[PDB]
């Protein structure tokens, strides 16, 4: 789980 | 519909290149994401946790840390910083 990947899942 | 950031949120978005005064939620989230990556606020061992207790982001959201997995809480925190 990377921050960038996980942040992109917000919307 | 565009949104208008309160002065401190606007400062944070500007520090990562934003030029406007109004944004879509998509643009605020993007910039906020860029900010956390640039300043390395996530735990490199536990990436879903953002530690902002000693950063401007802490002042803004009023929390010492938060989880990227808690989507509803992130938006709540952002909403308080919109007009």
């Amino acid at each position: 789980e990377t921050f960038s990947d996980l942040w992109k899942l917000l919307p | 519909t565009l949104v208008r950031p309160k002065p401190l949120l606007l400062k944070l978005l500007k520090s990562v290149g934003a030029q406007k005064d109004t944004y879509t939620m998509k643009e605020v989230l993007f910039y906020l994401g860029q900010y956390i990556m640039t300043k390395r606020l996530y735990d490199a061992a536990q990436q879903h946790i953002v530690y902002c207790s000693n950063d401007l982001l802490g002042d803004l959201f009023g929390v010492p840390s938060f989880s990227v997995k808690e989507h509803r809480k992130i938006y709540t925190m952002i909403y308080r910083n919109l007009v």
Side-chain angles (χ1 to χ4, degrees), chain B residues 35-49:
Chain B
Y35 182 90
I36 295 153
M37 303 183 211
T38 296
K39 293 205 130 198
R40 297 271 139 84
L41 305 167
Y42 56 94
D43 188 357
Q46 214 179 21
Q47 308 226 335
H48 69 102
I49 302 293

Side-chain angles (χ1 to χ4, degrees), chain A residues 1-4 6-11, chain B residues 29 33 36-37 47-48 68-69 71 75:
Chain A
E1 54 150 25
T2 64
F3 176 78
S4 301
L6 232 23
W7 191 258
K8 285 170 190 60
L9 287 168
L10 251 71
Chain B
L29 280 167
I36 295 153
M37 303 183 211
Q47 308 226 335
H48 69 102
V68 314
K69 299 224 203 80
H71 305 165
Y75 284 56

Side-chain angles (χ1 to χ4, degrees), chain B residues 12-65:
Chain B
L12 179 144
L13 308 176
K14 287 206 186 211
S15 79
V16 286
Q19 275 144 57
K20 296 187 283 157
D21 285 299
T22 53
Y23 299 89
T24 71
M25 267 294 286
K26 255 172 175 174
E27 304 174 302
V28 163
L29 280 167
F30 175 80
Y31 282 120
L32 183 71
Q34 295 304 112
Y35 182 90
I36 295 153
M37 303 183 211
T38 296
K39 293 205 130 198
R40 297 271 139 84
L41 305 167
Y42 56 94
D43 188 357
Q46 214 179 21
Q47 308 226 335
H48 69 102
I49 302 293
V50 181
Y51 287 106
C52 47
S53 77
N54 280 81
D55 183 82
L56 198 94
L57 185 61
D59 292 328
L60 186 74
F61 277 9
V63 296
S65 73

